[PDB]
DNA sequence: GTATGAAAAAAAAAATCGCATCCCGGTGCCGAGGCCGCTCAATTGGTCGTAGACAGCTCTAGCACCGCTTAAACGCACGTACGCGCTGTCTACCGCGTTTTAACCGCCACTAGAAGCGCTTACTAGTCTCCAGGCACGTGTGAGACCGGCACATGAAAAAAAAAACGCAGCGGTAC
DNA sequence: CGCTGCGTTTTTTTTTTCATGTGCCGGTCTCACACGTGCCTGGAGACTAGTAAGCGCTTCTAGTGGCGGTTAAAACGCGGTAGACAGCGCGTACGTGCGTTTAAGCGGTGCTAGAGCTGTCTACGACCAATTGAGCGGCCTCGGCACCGGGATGCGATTTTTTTTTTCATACTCGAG
Ligand SMILES: [Ca+2]
Ligand SMILES: [Ca+2]
C-alpha cells in the first residue's frame with residue numbers, strides 16, 4: 001500500500017485539534033472520575049451537569065496549557081518528544097511543586 | 099604559581115552568598131536607577147529611604163528567583179552555563195512574557 | 197472504581213495535539229493521569245468546601261467557578 | 277546627570293545574584309539580558325507605586341506605595357509595613 | 359468589535375466563544391488583561407513551533 | 414606501456430497516486446430573537462448628618478555636601494573545560510489494520526433536595542460613659558559583629574612509580 | 590627488506606606536601622532590645638432596638654439511575670523509521686587572579702519641601718418614602734448554522750528520469766622488425 005511517514009499524521013492531528021474546540025476527554029469516564037475524587041471529601045454528593053462540564057472545560061484547558069509549556073521544554077533540550085522530565089520542569093517553574 | 103580550576107571559586111562563591119542575606123547591588127547605583135525610572139512617570143518626585151530599600155529587597159529577591167528557574171533550564175539542556183535563551187524560557191513558562 | 201485509566205492514552209494524546217506536541221513518550225500517559233488527578237482533587241476539594249458551607253448536598257457550577265477563581269484558574273461562561 | 281544608570285547594576289553584582297541563584301557558569305550575554313529584565317520589573321513596580329503616590333496627592337513615594345505595588349504585581353513583601 | 363470581525367472572517371453572523379478566544383488571544387492588550395482567564399469552548403490559537411515542521 | 418574512456422552508483426527532481434482537506438449546494442431543526450404583561454428595583458424628591466475639602470502649623474525626614482577611606486569595579490592576561498556540531502547505533506514511538514469495548518443517543522420512572530416562602534428569636538449595630546490597654550517619648554546593658562589568632566579539612570601541587578607510543582638494533586628469511 | 594622485542598623516552602597514575610580558604614575560639618565596642626513611665630484613645634460595658642437569619646413546609650426541577658441500540662472509538666499488535674543518547678574533536682568563551690582606577694560608603698552637618706496632623710465649614714451622599722416603567726420570565730417563529738454528499742483542490746510519497754565520481758579495462762606512441 002501507501003503510508004504517511006512517522007510525524008505527518010501527528011502534524012495533522014495538531015492542525016485539526018488547534019482549529020477545533022470539542023472537549024477531547026470522553027464525557028462519562030471523566031464524570032465517574034469526578035465522583036470518585038469527590039467521595040474522598042464527602043459521600044452521597046450531587047452535581048449539576050454544568051458543574052461537571054465546568055470542571056471538564058478547565059482540566060482540559062489546563063492540561064492543554066501544560067503540554068504547551070512541556071513542549072517548549074522538550075524543545076529547549078534539542079528534542080521533539082515530550083517526556084516526564086519536561087512536565088516536571090514546567091510545573092516547577094510554574095510553581096505547582098517544589 | 100597557585101590558581102584554582104575554573105568553576106571552583108564559583109562554587110565557593112555560591113556557598114558564601116546562599117549562607118548570607120545582604121543586598122548584593124551597591125545601594126547608590128540602585129537608588130539612582132529607581133529615580134531615573136521614576137522620571138518616566140512623574141517629574142520632581144521624592145522617595146522615603148525605606149521605599150528605595152523595599153524595592154531593592156523586592157528586585158534582588160526576584161532576580162535571585164529567576165536565576166534559580168533560569169539555572170534549571172540551562173541544566174535541562176545538559177548545560178551548566180546559563181544563557182539568555184534559559185531566562186527567556188523561564189520568563190515564558192512563568193507568564194512574564196508570550 | 198479506578199476511573200483514572202478511563203483517561204485513555206488517545207485522549208491525552210488528543211490534548212497534547214491541541215498543545216502542539218508532535219511526539220509523545222509512553223511514560224507521559226501515566227504522568228498526565230497523575231497531574232490531572234492533583235488538579236481535579238485540588239479544585240473539587242475547594243469546590244465541595246463551597247458546597248458544604250451553603251449546606252447543599254448538590255455541587256453547583258458556581259461552587260466550581262468560585263474554586264477555579266481561588267485556585268487562580270478563573271473560568272468564563274458558567275456564571276460568576 | 278547620568279541618564280543611563282541601568283549600567284550601575286555592575287557585572288559583579290549580577291554575578292553575585294546569580295551565585296545566590298546557585299549558578300556555577302554565566303554566559304557574557306546575560307548581564308545585559310539581566311539588566312533588561314531588572315529594568316522591566318522596576319519600571320512595572322515603580323509605575324504602580326507612583327500611581328499610588330499620585331492618588332494620595334503626595335510628591336514623596338512611600339514604603340507603603342511600594343508594598344501596595346508589589347502586592348498587586350503578585351510579588352508580596354514582608355517587613356516594610358505589610 | 360474584534361470578535362465580530364473574527365465571526366465575519368469565519369463567515370458567521372452569530373459570535374460563538376472561539377470568536378471571543380480568537381479575538382482576545384490575537385489582541386496583545388486584551389490577552390494580557392485576560393492572562394489568567396480560561397474561555398470555555400474557545401480552544402487555542404493555531405501555533406506549531408517551527409522546529410517540529412518537516413523538510 | 415599510458416592516457417584514455419564507458420559502466421556502477423549515487424543523488425536528485427519530477428510525475429502517479431491517492432489521500433485527505435475546502436467549497437458547492439440542499440435539508441432540516443433548533444435556538445436566537447422578539448413580543449407580552451408583570452414585578453421590583455431604579456427614580457424622584459427632601460432632610461440630616463458626615464466625609465472630605467481647606468488652609469494653616471508643625472517638624473520630619475528627605476536631599477545634598479564634605480572629604481577621606483577603602484572596597485569594590487574594571488581591566489588585562491593566560492588556559493582549560495564546556496559548548497556545540499557531527500556522526501552512527503537501537504530502540505521506542507508513529508502509522509495503519511484486525512478485534513473489543515464502551516460512550517452517546519432518546520426514551521423510561523422516581524425522589525431529593527433545591528429553592529423558595531413564611532414566622533419567630535436571638536443576634537448585631539447603635540448610643541454613651543468609663544478604664545485600661547497600648548503607644549510615643551527617654552534610658553541602659555548586652556547580644557552580637559568585628560577583629561584577629563587557631564589548627565584544619567582540601568584541591569592543587571610536587572614527587573615517585575606503574576603503563577603506552579617511540580626508536581634502534583639484532584636477526585631471520587627470501588629471492589636473486 | 591620486514592618484523593619483532595626490548596631497552597628508551599615519554600605518559601598516565603599514584604602518593605605525599607602544600608598553600609588556602611574554613612569555620613572555629615575568646616576578648617571590645619556599638620546601637621538596638623527591652624524596659625519603663627505617663628498620657629490618650631479605642632475597647633468594654635450595657636442596654637436598646639430593629640432586623641438578619643434559621644428552621645419547616647410548599648413546590649416542582651433537575652439530578653440520578655436504567656434500558657438497550659449503533660457506531661465511533663479504544664484496544665492491541667506488527668512493522669519499520671527517525672529521533673534519543675553516547676561518543677569523538679575542535680575551538681573559544683569563561684573563569685581566575687593579578688594590577689590600575691573608581692566611586693561607594695560613612696558620618697557628621699545645614700537647609701527646606703512637603704508630610705501630616707489639626708482644627709474648621711459646607712457640598713454631597715445616605716436614607717426614606719412613594720411612584721412608575723424598564724428588565725425579566727415566558728411563549729412563538731423562522732432563519733441561520735449543522736449534517737449530507739460530490740467534486741475540485743492541495744500535498745506528501747513513491748517510483749522514474751538527471752549529474753558525479755569513480756573504476757576497471759581499451760584506443761594511441763615510441764622504438765622493433
Ligand atoms: Ca575573620
Ligand atoms: Ca498638604
Ligand SMILES: [K+]
Nearest residue numbers: 473474703704
Ligand atoms: K518629611
Ligand SMILES: [K+]
Nearest residue numbers: 526527650651
Ligand atoms: K433538583
